[PDB]
Amino acid sequence: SGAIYVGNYRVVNRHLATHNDWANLVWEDSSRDLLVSSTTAQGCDTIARCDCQTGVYYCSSRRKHYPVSFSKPSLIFVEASEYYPARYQSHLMLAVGHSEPGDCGGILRCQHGVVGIVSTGGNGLVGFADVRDLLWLDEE
């Protein structure tokens, strides 16, 4: 589980979005496993705006933050999972590391702030849904 809280936005894995999230929808994209809902309270999480391929992620299934190298966001074939069929997930970054389904929503952070959230895993790879291209999370 886990979210990003920036301005009047809450950024969650689309597959973990609540009824309250869908009742307060701003933007969702199934191909990226992202959903953004409206917040009453201002958020102050800083979104990275950068090209970084090094950072740190939170892994709930180890209670540990791990430093990783990761690929730039891309369209990647992800084995069938419980919530998406076998498919191209878009805007996905991969790193060598541990992840289990409930790690979804752990933050990946670089020197510039929040890069993304844990979304895919298996075969020793963890995938993160990028948010750095979502420039509108900054404004309005």
- Please give the annotated binding residues for Zn(2+), written as ranges: 50, 52, 110, 112
Q: Is 104 a catalytic residue?
A: yes
Q: Which of 7, 28 has the CB closer to ligand GV4?
A: 28
Q: Which of 83, 136 has the CB closer to ligand GV4?
A: 83
Cα–Cα distances (Å) from 1 to 39, 46, 58, 69, 84, in that order, read 18, 19, 11, 22, 17
Q: Is 33 a catalytic residue?
A: yes
115, two tokens:
């890069």
Instruction: Identify the active-site residue in 33, 45, 103, 130.
Output: 33
Phi, psi at 128, each rounded to 5°: -125, 130
74: β partners: 92
Which residues 10-49 are close enough to bind ligand GV4 by CB under 6 A? Answer: 15
Instruction: Identify the active-site residue in 15, 29, 65, 98.
Output: 15
Catalytic residues: 15, 33, 104
